[PDB]
Amino acid sequence: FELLHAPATVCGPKKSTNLVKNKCVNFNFNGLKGTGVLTESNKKFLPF
Amino acid sequence: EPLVDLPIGINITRFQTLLALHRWTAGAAAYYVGYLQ
Numbered sequence: 001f002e003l004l005h006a007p008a009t010v011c012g013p014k015k016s017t018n019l020v021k022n023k024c025v026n027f028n029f030n031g032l033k034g035t036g037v038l039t040e041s042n043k044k045f046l047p048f
Numbered sequence: 049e050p051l052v053d054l055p056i057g058i059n060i061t062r063f064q065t066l067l068a069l070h071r072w073t074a075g076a077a078a079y080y081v082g083y084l085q
Contacts, residue, residue, distance in 0.1 A: 007055045
């Protein structure tokens with residue numbers, strides 16, 4: 001395998017921990033990094 | 049809306065449309081081609 005960075009078709013397993021809500025947490029969602037409290041959302045996201 | 053994103057990773061400079069010849073014989077079709085800038 002080639003480790004030179006390029007579009008990576010094959011990737012090792014990512015590791016998702018359990019999700020907590022209503023508590024201040026550092027959070028990561030597919031590379032999106034933030035600090036905050038997560039709560040249920042009324043806003044209607046589009047599927048994509 | 050986005051349909052797919054494909055990691056093809058190849059260069060493209062031309063494209064060709066594909067028409068299905070039904071039961072050669074095919075009905076009239078109308079299609080439109082514009083170029084993004």
